[PDB]
Amino acid sequence: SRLNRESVIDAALELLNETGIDGLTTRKLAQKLGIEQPTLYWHVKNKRALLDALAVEILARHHDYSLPAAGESWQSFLRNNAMSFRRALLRYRDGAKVHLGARPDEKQYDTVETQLRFMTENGFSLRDGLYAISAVSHFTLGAVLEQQEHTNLPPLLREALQIMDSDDGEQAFLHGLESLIRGFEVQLTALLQIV
């Protein structure tokens, strides 16, 4: 098949949905592409190189709300941004593990920079804006990994689980997301006051 970057990644993602991350190997990627292992190696040095690239391509391809709209609030941008991240991470099997393992890369540097600047433009110190972004990010990754990694008992526990299972974990994600955004707001608002 074609072994340009885009084609190698198409096939690696397609494989990831077949095998998950633990089973994704270069050997199996080579078979999928109908090529010998040493041909693939010209293109893809190892699995870590492969994963590094998938993590970025997944976000470039499906993470539509990297940047805020003109006039958008930081409440609404962190909302939309976190929702876009969750969806892009769920679109591929072990998506959040492929994300976790990778390097916030040169090509996304300007995305994350814009975000840190955006947050500083609406009244966050750098410090408190990076904490806001890292918490959203850590909350969203953790919920998505649980959703993905789950792939007689006491009553509350029985009912709680039954309820978590009702939907994908989206209601529990969006609820905690609102708590997190408001917590940030209550902090930002108070300034030097004891809160």
Place this chain on the structure above:
Amino acid sequence: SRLNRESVIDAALELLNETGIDGLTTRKLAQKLGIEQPTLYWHVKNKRALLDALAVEILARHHDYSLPAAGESWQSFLRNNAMSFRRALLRYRDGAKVHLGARPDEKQYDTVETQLRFMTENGFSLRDGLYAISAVSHFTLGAVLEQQEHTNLPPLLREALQIMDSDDGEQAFLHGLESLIRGFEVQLTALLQIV
């Protein structure tokens, strides 16, 4: 060596700190114990069985704040509980991945039940208390995985990272933790009012 449960786990944890989760195999556990693979298999059917057990033993051994103190608030219990979880997950290499992969097990059912009941006793609906517990849990896991899985650029990004690196990610963890607890409080407090 001894192949009682406690001894098998001691050696598996010791191995996990040597290899991490990806390198932990039953074959290597057998070598570490000085036993043949089929002797180990009598004791430990596979890696998934092994991981299931480590995840639980890690919490039984080092997660000291499963349950709240007499008189403690739900703000302070979720604080202490999340801090105990983070520490227990960091005590072993890829601790959060060993946690993620496992089954909230019969032996911890009563711990998590007590917690769901505790939260309902201080004015949460079951629904809103499970969302509170799952968000703490998802936030803490995600921060711990990032801390663990991280194992020239634009300025804000440069300074932000420099700052994240200053400590282990504990300041960013404890800051987001306070936002999350307050977000919950603002929700719980309002009742039927628009907030």
